[PDB]
Design an enzyme around this catalytic site. Structure first.
Site, PDB file in Angstrom:
ATOM      1  N   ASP A   1       0.811  -1.198   0.000  1.00  0.00           N
ATOM      2  CA  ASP A   1       0.000   0.000   0.000  1.00  0.00           C
ATOM      3  C   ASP A   1       0.854   1.262   0.000  1.00  0.00           C
ATOM      4  O   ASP A   1       1.902   1.333   0.652  1.00  0.00           O
ATOM      5  CB  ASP A   1      -0.876  -0.007   1.245  1.00  0.00           C
TER       6      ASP A   1
ATOM      7  N   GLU B   1       1.161  -0.663  -5.246  1.00  0.00           N
ATOM      8  CA  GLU B   1       0.085   0.286  -5.558  1.00  0.00           C
ATOM      9  C   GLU B   1       0.702   1.666  -5.773  1.00  0.00           C
ATOM     10  O   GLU B   1       0.766   2.500  -4.870  1.00  0.00           O
ATOM     11  CB  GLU B   1      -0.960   0.317  -4.444  1.00  0.00           C
TER      12      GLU B   1
END
Ligand SMILES: OCC1=C[C@H](N[C@H]2C[C@H](CO)[C@@H](O)[C@H](O)[C@H]2O)[C@H](O)[C@@H](O)[C@@H]1O
Ligand SMILES: OCC1=C[C@H](N[C@H]2C[C@H](CO)[C@@H](O)[C@H](O)[C@H]2O)[C@H](O)[C@@H](O)[C@@H]1O
Ligand SMILES: [Ca+2]
Ligand SMILES: [Ca+2]
Ligand SMILES: [Mg+2]
Ligand SMILES: [Mg+2]
Lengths: 548, 548
Positions: free
Chosen positions: B204, B246
């Site tokens: 993330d 990401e």
């Protein structure tokens, strides 16, 4: 031109469409409440299955009084108010004239079976209304229609001691049309409804009026003259009304039901020879059948119009196809013997196409683009399935599905208590397939069906164009033009499940541009030899124009 | 090659997929009972949203304990059993590692906030786990991601007395990666799950690790270098696992997160730059944005593989297109203000395409045919809708719609008791949209998807091929080849709502015969100079091969 020529028709059964008082039966007030629906869809003329008092042995095609309303469906006031509220919206409404036969519970039969001699000794004028025989040997060499039920086109009446004649159920004694008192009771039955404002009749089972020995007793010229006399009375007394024939006979024999310019018969007939070619060609990825049977159709009169359909309250009839054709039909569309009935398949349209909306859309566009006036079977426009646990042909007649409430919003009575069970299977049940859903769904079959009807409305060539089949190089591709009043349509449609390639013969059209009927999008200009090269995705339809 | 290059990823959330204990929340026992669903769907690797203990201020991306299973989801045992059953069926599993920031409730930051000096006067070792500021003036010129909630990336702590930094929610304090303890804490968290058998990690907010004054605090070298070391440990200690990144940036910067061949970073990153171009270029009916952005993407390392995706658990991001491009998307896809959150649109794939199965299918095939390993978002495979009455981005994380039983089959709890409420609107609710229904519907979107994956299985050129765009002359039409191990696949897609024509540049392929991947129907042989004419219906996808 004529109003039936440019009109979109919609077949529905009052008992099944919408119930306003909550007794589980669809009624005329209910149907009145839903005319706003039908008008926004693109519908122009409602066609109502028989609404007459009846024991409903054949769902009300066994009429027991041509001049009243069936209690199930409300009253004559209810009927009168409905036809007003439909006319105030610009809908035409037509009815079903059951002319070949009446129920055994008609007051005519209930007298005819007493004997040719009444108690006092007088002749019983009503015995001659139906045809009788003493041994039942006559009109053999004749085809049985409901063979699953009926062993003999004759049946003995235990009190008349004779045999009566019936081309359908035992309870529907055929009407003796050699008896000119019967042509007048019928002319009266039609007059009674035309007198009320009704815009016309679909006339049921017209090939079978008269029976002569040594013939098939279908399409007898004796029968056609009776029809001619009917259109006579309608043309003289009630100009502009519509007479629509249901003639499921071979190409040539059916066009005989239009009559001639000199001697008119029906205004439109059902194009019953193409509908099965539509289906059987879709599984064969071969559009040849469609094109053959269309060639075989002799030109129809000026006043006549065709009436294109995919499905109706009846089975997918399969008795005017070849023996190899009907066996193919069974293998591709009736995997379960429960789906066979009386030489045909008794399935709704979506289940026939394996719920494939690409297919459902494609057949529907053919239905619009073929020459005629299309008729949508109620519910098909939202993708309704069927229920083959029900007897006879009732499987395709379940209640309309308006929402996901009690009994699909067709009634406030429980589904166990509606005249037919509202479908609730996990695929076609009303929890999934309902009008409320499809008016919120920006891309529903209902919004699609309505938008397509809007497209066709925008192009009168669809209603009044001629039909020219264009060669493609590819049997899975069906191409044709429609010309009328300067505009030329080009309708190319893939009948295959994967990309197909095609070479269209637009040689007549070199110099002109095909442009899409929606989007105003031009393709390349037809050039040189006019062999127009084309690729088509699966189940596609190209609605195109050719400008100048 | 490596397994992720051939994997179909399927993103789901344990709290929202299947409840196996009645309590209204999904759990690992439950998810385990649905693994045969995923196996049979054609899914290779499950990406599970954060399963760690959390107050759930940000749905669990605000982690409070990197080493437990959140009690809502069961226990570490329930996890080990799931991971054992998943592997048994050849599924890979990757978790969600939230490196950039912990929860406010995390022990570390609860210790950090006590201040630099503990009440006994000794240093507080946990204070430097987080980035503090005495006045909040540093790292100006930084952007805010959660613009609709946070007015600054500094928040004053009421105890700590100072400002702590946070790229997201103020209840998600950023971890301080200039602190070597923190970089070790991160590896320890990674080892704990890799050791349990986890096949890798989606990571993330990778671009927001290291902040430096005078920079965007985005994509910084100091960040990448911490990311190299993470890969370094995983390649050494746990060979073969997957680090997936990401990194929603511009094309040049996104590709940096693969590292070089000498200095590897991530194995794969999400293809964020192409995603919004697809939606935009469907509306514009012009696919030059796709060809453009896709072409600014640099070549990527040998180990590297793209992860193509249509939607996810977040909103459709528009912070990476031009102001002009972003306005068009709002006017095209967010008509109600409610649909915007944080420079993006918070809607499900089907609503975004107005529930048109044709357009869903087009974008689905372009996801499966672009070069990369595709990831599905749970429920997008049956057409699940959204529920924008729910805060933040939860409107697309509603429960899975399994059957039309209680709460969509997700729970025996009442819908009013499940964590997010199971959708029940007329269009997208579970009476119409659910797995059991789509298993019995012959042509359901669920089956359509299974088959399309099953078809992509037979043609490795999708997973591994190069990508060569073919000019068309119609920007509506997108065309490109995939070449791998001899097979040349020609993919041509129509992004317009009506028929379109094109002149494909198949010069490098003259003499080759295009046939369809499905059924091998042939199109004309490429002849001449290779300017192949093609026509297409709306939303049409031709998947072809070209032999030799
Ligand atoms: O053979 C042609 C047909 C006419 C018949 N249709 C009419 C015959 C009956 C009149 O009593 C009635 O059952 C049916 O609804 C009418 O539409 C038959 O039942 C159909 O299966 C078939 O398509
Ligand atoms: O611009 C890239 C993005 C990253 C962010 N995604 C992570 C940010 C948060 C980490 O705590 C979390 O809310 C989100 O689910 C993660 O996927 C952001 O929330 C997204 O809306 C956005 O598309
Ligand atoms: Ca008769
Ligand atoms: Ca950080
Ligand atoms: Mg009633
Ligand atoms: Mg649970």
């Amino acid at each position: 031109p004529e109003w039936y020529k440019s009109a979109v028709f919609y077949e529905l059964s009052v008992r099944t469409f919408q119930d306003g008082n909550g007794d589980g039966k669809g009624d005329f007030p209910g149907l009145t409440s839903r005319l706003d629906y039908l008008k926004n869809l693109g519908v122009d003329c409602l066609w109502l299955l028989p609404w007459f008092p009846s024991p409903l042995r054949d769902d009300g095609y066994d009429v027991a009084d041509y001049r009243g309303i069936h209690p199930d469906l409300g009253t004559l006031d209810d009927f009168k108010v409905f036809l007003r509220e439909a006319h105030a919206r610009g809908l035409w409404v037509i009815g079903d004239l059951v002319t070949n036969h009446t129920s055994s519970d008609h007051p005519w039969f209930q007298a005819a079976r007493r004997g040719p001699t009444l108690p006092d000794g007088s002749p019983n004028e009503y015995h001659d209304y139906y045809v009788w025989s003493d041994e039942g040997k006559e009109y053999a060499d004749t085809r049985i229609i409901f063979t699953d039920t009926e062993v003999s086109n004759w049946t003995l009446d235990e009190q008349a001691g004779k045999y009566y004649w019936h081309r359908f159920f035992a309870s529907q004694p055929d009407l003796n049309y050699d008896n000119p008192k019967v042509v007048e009771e019928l002319h009266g039955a039609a007059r009674f409804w035309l007198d009320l404002g009704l815009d016309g009749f679909r006339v049921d089972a017209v090939p079978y009026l008269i029976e002569r020995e040594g013939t098939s007793c279908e399409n007898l010229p004796e029968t056609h003259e009776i029809l001619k006399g009917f259109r006579a009375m309608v043309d003289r007394e009630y100009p502009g009304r519509l007479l629509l024939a249901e003639a499921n006979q071979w190409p040539e024999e059916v066009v005989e039901y239009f009559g001639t310019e000199a001697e008119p018969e029906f205004h439109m007939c059902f194009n019953f020879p193409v509908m099965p070619r539509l289906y059987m060609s879709l599984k064969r990825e071969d559009t040849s059948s469609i094109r053959e049977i269309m060639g075989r159709l002799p030109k129809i009169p000026s006043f006549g119009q065709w009436c294109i359909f995919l499905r109706n309250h009846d089975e997918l009839t399969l008795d005017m196809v070849t023996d190899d054709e009907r066996a193919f039909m069974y293998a591709a569309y009736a995997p379960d013997a429960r789906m066979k009935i009386n030489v045909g398949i008794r399935r709704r349209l979506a289940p026939l196409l394996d719920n494939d909306r690409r297919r459902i859309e494609l057949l529907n566009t053919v239905l619009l683009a073929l020459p005629g006036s299309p008729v949508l079977y109620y519910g098909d426009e939202i993708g309704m399935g069927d229920d083959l646990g029900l007897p006879d042909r009732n499987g395709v007649r379940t209640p309309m599905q308006w929402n996901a409430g009690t009994s699909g919003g067709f009634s406030t009575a429980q589904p166990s208590d509606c005249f037919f069970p509202p479908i609730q299977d996990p695929v076609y049940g009303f929890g999934r397939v309902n009008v409320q859903s499809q008016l919120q769904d920006p891309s529903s079959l209902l919004k699609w069906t309505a938008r397509q009807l809007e497209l066709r409305r925008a192009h009168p060539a669809f209603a009044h164009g001629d039909l020219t089949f264009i060669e493609t190089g590819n049997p899975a591709i069906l191409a044709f033009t429609r010309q009328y009043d300067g505009e030329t349509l080009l309708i190319v449609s893939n009948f295959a499940g994967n990309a197909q390639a095609g070479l269209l013969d637009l040689a007549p059209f070199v110099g002109r541009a095909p442009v899409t009927l929606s989007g105003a999008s031009p393709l390349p200009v037809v050039t040189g030899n006019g062999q127009y090269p084309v690729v088509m995705g699966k189940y596609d339809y190209y609605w195109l124009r050719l400008n100048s």
